[PDB]
Design a protein around this ligand. Structure first.
Ligand SMILES: Nc1nc2c(ncn2[C@@H]2O[C@H](COP(=O)(O)OP(=O)(O)OP(=O)(O)O)[C@@H](O)[C@H]2O)c(=O)[nH]1
Ligand SMILES: [Mg+2]
Ligand SMILES: [Mg+2]
Ligand SMILES: [Mg+2]
Ligand SMILES: [Mg+2]
Ligand SMILES: [Mg+2]
Ligand SMILES: [Mg+2]
Ligand SMILES: [Mg+2]
Ligand SMILES: [Mg+2]
Ligand SMILES: [Zn+2]
Lengths: 37, 80, 43, 205, 118, 23, 157, 422, 140
RNA sequence: ACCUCGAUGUUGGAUCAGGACAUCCCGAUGGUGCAGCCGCUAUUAAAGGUUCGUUUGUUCAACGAUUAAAGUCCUACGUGAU
RNA sequence: CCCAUAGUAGGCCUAAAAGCAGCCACCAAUUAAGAAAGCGUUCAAGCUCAACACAAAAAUCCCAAACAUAUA
């Protein structure tokens, strides 16, 4: 998880989900794509 | 999974679900995943009978089931 | 916590001031009066 | 020569006389380089600011790298830095005369085009890196086509026409209603409240 | 029934009640939900205390005030009671509480597709 | 005309490729 | 502070009031307007010509096959004079009523591929389909006479 | 900043500092190219001054120093003086700056300026700050009486932090913070190389004097068109690794490094730290010499002195493949000393011979063994070898179901193969 | 699985180009090259011939072969050994439309290659495009 | 140059420390060019802890030996009516 | 979301570099597909796209209490 003010899907498998009050880029094939707003 | 049979009457309506199920199940990817698995897409209300490798039968009467529901049940029974 | 540097209302970093509906209505009322004044001076 | 031309740090003949920082050259709407010329796309400056040689290099490198030379061409719509900005030695006390010329900038006013692009291309092909450059510019900027610029101007005109507010900054300032000219500036009589210092408010009517 | 007060919005989790024991590191900030769970009267007590004038009569007024978490009230207080004030907020009715007559009166706003799983 | 629409589709694909070059 | 500042300079309260009063007010449209009330014809001609020329027509669902399997099926069909055709349903729906095929409406849904011919090799075609226990023969209409699969089998025999 | 520079070259006559290998004209040409590198200024005046005591504080004698300061003060167009004296000591810099009225730069400071202005790296900025820490006599061109009496005098019985105490504290704190930041950047640079080391890529460092053609040689070897050599001095700022293929079909990293310079404290230049540590960790060292340059011997001596001062491993010093570039400039050239590969980077004349030579060098250095190995087909042994070791040749026995593969394999990969596929 | 190769009829040599790839899927390379040489004897010798081998899960061979390539065939027809470098301006041989027709006569006849377009226009246009891509000009 | 020059005693140290977290250690957690061991990076966490010496007035720095670590700061560069 | 045959593994180039290492051509057939818009391969093989069909953080302790709906 890296904190980013702007969230970008870095591959096809990244998906945006609003959880615990903020947006997250989650990815299973490339966990390093994990971003937190 | 061992065998899958799909039966329907196209001249009779309410067959879109079963027809799409036939197309998706017969898609070359599934048959390549299990070549041993045999599909018999007969046709003559519409029904789908799936016999698994464990001799277990699933019967889906697709008169009022959407293809998504039929495929989800089929996958769930595959998982067993 | 929550300090305004230096003196309020004068410096570069002033205490924010926000217009209320009351102030907006007052200014609008004065503007209406002055518009009527324009009309009555135009003749 | 479709690629964007190199811009020198300072004029070949350096200015010898220090000149005042007349911020009016940044203040207010732009009256020059406001329309397209030999191009179909551009970077429009929605605010005033000074462009340095660093900004010029950023624009040149980014546009040159991201463009297609065989199908796209770019041209500057802003002159090379000419206005000299002077800085005193670090830690100098106030007084002792004006500082020596440190850098050269070029002023840019709101509503001006900084770079203009054209060629056998459409907007979507260019808007990406034009927006990158605009976002990295020192002032608010936007990648705008001829069509988009005309659309935004027409939208501004439509808002001015159909606004339901009986009171407008233009009217009040011109008529000196409430004596607001005591608070306003003489420039406001022409800015109509759409400009505040170097900042241009587009939603402002 | 001060235990059964209702907060509008997310105040249960956002409203923070702050105090300082005086000793260093004695700053305690407890959310509204936590304070309610600890003391079922503190929320209303503090609200009334804040709304009362900030003078020397406030503590006497708070003495006159009586708060009880649940329906139970002391017999002497009940005998003292004179009038019952109307509740400031009318409690909305739940579906389980809505009568069949009201449900029938309210029209059906749309025709759901017959072949929908819902 | 089949050839007309074939050429139109080819040109549309070319335009899409040009647009997506940067994307 | 200069008239032009790097930051948004604080406005005099009267100027702030003036700006707030002279903000833009959009026109409210009373009732929201939101809730107020070549290739196609080329393949039209192609379908008309196909129907007029072919004496027998059948349809199927050749979508579950590989590219090479579909190519092999096409080659086996072309060994006979029969021709396999692909057309969109979106534009095939009008053709049924246009050519007066009312009974054909509930036959062309989803993937549908035509098997137009004049000389029926239906016997060998069914033999070919037999070794692939899927891709069922779907109802067609020979010479303006709708035939079910039992009808096709009887005609084959 | 559009500066004007007087290039003062101390020509050392007799004693230490007397350069037998090179001439004053060549050295001043080198300095002129150095200053031209920065894109900001150029040499307006050049003076070569004879000196017999280069080690003294003022470098020059009394008369020569007075003569120099006379011209420097008389000519106003000069903004700074570049003293081609390697590094100046702090007292020497202070005295010369005070006498001449303008900033005085030496080779060390000029190179630091090259790094900061051209390669705007945090390393360069921090190094410039570190070297600039000595700061006194702010107002040059004039001696300013100050009369610092009575500032911060005792209030009751003592005084607070005085000047020259605050200056010392700030100096110590700044040195500490700069060193700590430089250490962090060094650790990050080391981190960058972990994956390369684990994959055990043969890494070769191309070293040599500036403009010898290291970048051009790497471009020729790898085939990468992105590499852009330049005629400018110190053009190849920053160190970068490029992959290339050898005749043995092996993949090898060439570490394009910053070119070395004569009379320069490379160990004390922080921007050179990446180059120095990369050559230290290199498996092989490729020494590129521009034989066409008249100062070839001096350039070789300087580079070799730097390499020796690096205290690199003895095997690394040995087997350092020497490549004589720019041979085309010399019409007819014959390498007298053996084991040197004459090549033309631009024209690619001896590149094949160089490739074979350093391929043998890599095989010797990296410890990889060339051997023929038998692998059962359909085992995936062959694919594993394809991935983890270079495969010179494959010969499959159709009947047996095995293949004899001539492969160059490292000890690690060989052990992994033996364990994974016994 | 299906393995595609462009092996030359005469050059049935097991090893460098065929050994590893075929073995990765599992083969009797001796059998494969023996059958390929049988096909080479059946057809002309010394010419590339695309193949469509299908390694069945039962570890058996079904070699499917057809016409020679198009590029080498066109080069042979035009009397060229090595193709043009530019192929847009460089030309090494010319072929007449009649010759193109004649070669096409024996082209659209292979099951695997899919060239079964009944119209002659389809195949002639395809081979014309191939020649234009190659360093061969279309005469008249 | 806004308070203080009919005095606001001002470096470093001792003593006692209050506070912030932008966390040095201990806790939990995501990523890694995370095989393991070491690490690096980011989120959360300020309850507790955060050494002794040689020279140097040093704060610091270097060095010696350790430690889980020997944190960055604010507090009139905290604290001389201690 | 589905789906991808193809003259052929377009030529040259290279040990082979086959849409996918580099340059030039960059057509054309299938109802429908850029000699391929991206991954991957020692090279292949394999996976996708266009095309068919369907905002912010600091150092003594946050800082009025609270409140969305009874007619300006
Ligand atoms: N005639 C000739 N000129 C060469 C040759 N190799 C390099 N050069 C020239 O010398 C220049 C050297 O540029 P680079 O190769 O970038 O320099 P470098 O060796 O990296 O050295 P630095 O720039 O100091 O880092 C080239 O750009 C050419 O102008 C060669 O073989 N022959
Ligand atoms: Mg204040
Ligand atoms: Mg005195
Ligand atoms: Mg004062
Ligand atoms: Mg004053
Ligand atoms: Mg007093
Ligand atoms: Mg934190
Ligand atoms: Mg201070
Ligand atoms: Mg697609
Ligand atoms: Zn991802």
């Amino acid at each position: 998880f890296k904190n980013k003010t702007v969230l970008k899907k870095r591959c096809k498998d990244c998906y945006l989900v609003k959880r615990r009050g903020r947006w997250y880029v989650y990815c299973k094939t490339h966990p390093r794509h994990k971003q937190r707003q | 999974v061992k065998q899958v049979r799909v039966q329907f009457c196209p001249f009779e309506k309410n067959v879109e679900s079963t027809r799409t199920f036939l197309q998706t199940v017969s898609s070359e990817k599934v048959r390549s995943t299990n070549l041993n698995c045999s599909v018999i897409a007969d046709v003559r209300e519409p029904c789908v009978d799936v016999l698994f490798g464990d001799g277990h039968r699933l019967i889906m009467r697709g008169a009022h089931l959407t293809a998504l529901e039929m495929l989800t049940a089929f996958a769930s029974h595959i998982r067993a | 916590r929550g300090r305004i540097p230096g003196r309020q209302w004068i410096g570069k970093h002033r205490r924010p001031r926000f217009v209320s509906l009351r102030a907006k209505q007052n200014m609008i009322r004065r503007l209406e009066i002055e518009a009527e004044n324009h009309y009555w001076l135009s003749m | 020569k479709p690629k964007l031309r190199f811009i020198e740090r300072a004029p070949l003949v350096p200015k010898v006389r220090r000149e005042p920082k007349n911020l009016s050259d940044i203040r207010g709407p732009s009256t020059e380089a406001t329309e397209f010329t030999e191009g179909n796309f551009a970077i429009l400056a929605l605010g005033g600011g000074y462009l340095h040689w660093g900004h010029f290099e950023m624009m040149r490198l980014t546009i040159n790298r991201s463009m297609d030379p065989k199908n796209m061409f770019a041209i500057w719509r802003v002159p090379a830095p000419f206005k000299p900005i002077t800085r005193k030695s670090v830690g100098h006390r106030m007084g002792g005369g004006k500082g020596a010329i440190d850098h050269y900038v070029t002023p840019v006013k709101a509503g001006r085009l900084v770079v203009e692009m054209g060629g056998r291309c459409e907007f979507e092909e260019v808007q990406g890196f034009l927006d990158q450059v605009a976002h990295k510019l020192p002032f608010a900027a936007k990648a705008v086509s001829r069509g988009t610029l005309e659309k935004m101007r027409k939208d501004q005109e439509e808002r001015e026409r159909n606004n339901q507010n009986p009171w407008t900054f233009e009217r009040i300032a011109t008529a000196n209603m409430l004596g607001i000219r005591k608070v306003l500036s003489p420039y406001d009589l022409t800015h109509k409240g759409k400009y505040w210092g170097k900042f241009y408010m587009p939603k402002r009517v | 029934n001060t235990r059964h007060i209702a907060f509008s919005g997310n105040k249960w989790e956002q409203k923070v009640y702050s105090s300082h024991t005086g000793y260093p590191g004695g700053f305690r900030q407890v959310t509204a939900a936590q304070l309610h769970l600890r003391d079922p009267v503190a929320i209303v007590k503090l609200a009334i205390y804040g709304m009362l004038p900030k003078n020397l009569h406030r503590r006497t007024m708070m003495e006159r005030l009586h708060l009880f978490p649940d329906e139970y009230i002391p017999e002497d207080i009940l005998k003292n009671l004179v009038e019952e004030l109307p509740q400031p907020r009318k409690i909305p009715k739940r579906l389980d509480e809505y009568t069949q007559e009201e449900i029938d009166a309210f029209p059906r706003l749309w025709t759901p597709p017959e072949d929908y799983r819902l | 005309s089949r050839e007309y629409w074939r050429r139109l589709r080819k040109q549309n694909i070319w335009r899409h490729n040009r647009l997506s070059k940067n994307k | 502070s200069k008239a032009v500042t790097r930051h948004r300079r604080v406005m005099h309260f009267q100027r702030q009031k003036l700006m707030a009063v002279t903000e833009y007010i959009p026109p409210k449209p009373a009732i929201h307007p939101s809730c107020l009330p070549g290739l196609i014809r080329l393949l039209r001609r192609e379908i008309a010509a196909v129907f007029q020329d072919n004496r027998m027509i059948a349809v199927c669902q050749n979508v579950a096959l590989s590219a090479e399997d579909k190519l092999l099926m096409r080659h086996q069909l072309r060994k006979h004079k029969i021709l396999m055709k692909v057309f969109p349903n979106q534009v095939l729906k009008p053709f049924l009523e246009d050519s007066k095929y009312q009974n054909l409406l509930p036959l062309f849904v989803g993937h549908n591929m035509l098997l137009v011919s004049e000389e029926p090799k239906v016997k060998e075609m069914v033999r070919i389909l037999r070794t692939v226990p899927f891709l069922p023969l779907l109802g067609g209409c020979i010479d303006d006479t709708i035939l079910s699969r039992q009808g096709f089998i009887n005609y084959s025999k | 900043g559009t500066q004007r520079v007087c290039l003062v070259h101390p020509d050392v006559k007799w004693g230490p500092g007397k350069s037998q290998m090179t001439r004053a004209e060549w050295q001043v040409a080198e300095a002129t190219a150095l200053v031209h590198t920065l894109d900001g200024w150029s040499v307006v005046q050049t003076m070569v001054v004879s000196t017999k005591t280069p080690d003294r504080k003022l470098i020059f004698g009394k008369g020569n120093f007075e003569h120099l300061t006379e011209k420097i003060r008389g000519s106003p167009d000069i903004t700074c003086v570049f003293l081609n004296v390697e590094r100046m000591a702090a007292p020497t810099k202070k005295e010369l700056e005070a006498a001449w009225g303008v900033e005085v730069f030496d080779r060390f400071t000029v190179v630091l300026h090259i790094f900061r202005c051209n390669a705007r790296t945090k390393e360069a900025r921090l190094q410039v700050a570190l070297a600039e820490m000595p700061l006194h006599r702010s107002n040059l061109k004039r001696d300013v009486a100050h009369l610092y009496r009575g500032v911060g005098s005792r209030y009751i019985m003592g005084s607070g932090e005085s000047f020259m105490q605050l200056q010392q504290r700030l100096l110590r704190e700044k040195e500490a913070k700069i060193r700590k930041a430089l250490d962090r950047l060094r650790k990050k640079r080391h981190l960058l190389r972990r994956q390369r080391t684990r994959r055990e890529f043969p890494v070769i460092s191309v070293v040599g004097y500036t403009n010898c053609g290291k970048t051009t040689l790497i471009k020729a070897l790898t085939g990468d068109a992105a590499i852009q050599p330049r005629d400018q001095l110190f053009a190849t700022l920053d160190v970068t690794a490029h992959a290339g293929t050898l005749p043995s079909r092996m993949t090898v990293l060439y570490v394009d490094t910053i070119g070395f310079l004569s009379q320069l404290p490379h160990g004390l230049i922080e921007s050179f730290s990446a180059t120095l540590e990369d050559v230290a960790h290199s498996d092989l060292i490729l020494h590129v010499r521009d034989v066409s340059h008249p100062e070839a011997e001096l350039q070789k001596c300087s580079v070799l002195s730097t390499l020796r001062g690096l205290q690199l491993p003895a095997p690394l010093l040995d087997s350092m493949v020497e490549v004589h570039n720019k041979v085309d400039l010399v019409p007819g050239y014959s390498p007298t000393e053996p084991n040197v590969v004459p090549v033309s980077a631009l024209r690619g004349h001896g590149l094949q011979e160089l490739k074979a030579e350093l391929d043998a060098a890599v095989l010797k250095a990296t410890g990889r063994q060339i051997l023929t190995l038998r692998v059962r087909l359909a085992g995936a042994q062959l694919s594993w070898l394809y991935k983890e070791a270079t495969v010179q040749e494959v010969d499959v026995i159709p009947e047996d179901g095995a293949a004899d593969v001539r492969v160059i394999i490292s000890n690690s990969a060989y052990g992994k193969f033996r364990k994974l596929f016994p | 699985g299906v393995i595609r190769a462009i092996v030359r009829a005469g050059l049935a040599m097991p090893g460098p180009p065929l050994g590893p790839v075929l073995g990765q899927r599992g083969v009797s390379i001796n059998q494969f090259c023996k059958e390929f040489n049988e096909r080479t004897k059946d057809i002309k010798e010394g010419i590339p011939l695309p193949t469509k081998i299908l390694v069945k899960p039962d570890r058996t061979f079904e070699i499917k072969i057809g016409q020679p390539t198009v590029s080498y065939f066109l080069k042979a027809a035009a009397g060229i050994e090595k193709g043009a470098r530019q192929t847009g301006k460089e030309v090494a041989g010319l072929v007449t439309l009649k010759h193109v027709y004649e070669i096409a006569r024996i082209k659209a006849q292979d099951e695997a290659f899919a060239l079964q377009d009944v119209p002659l226009s389809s195949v002639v246009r395809s081979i014309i495009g191939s020649a234009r891509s190659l360093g061969i000009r279309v005469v008249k």
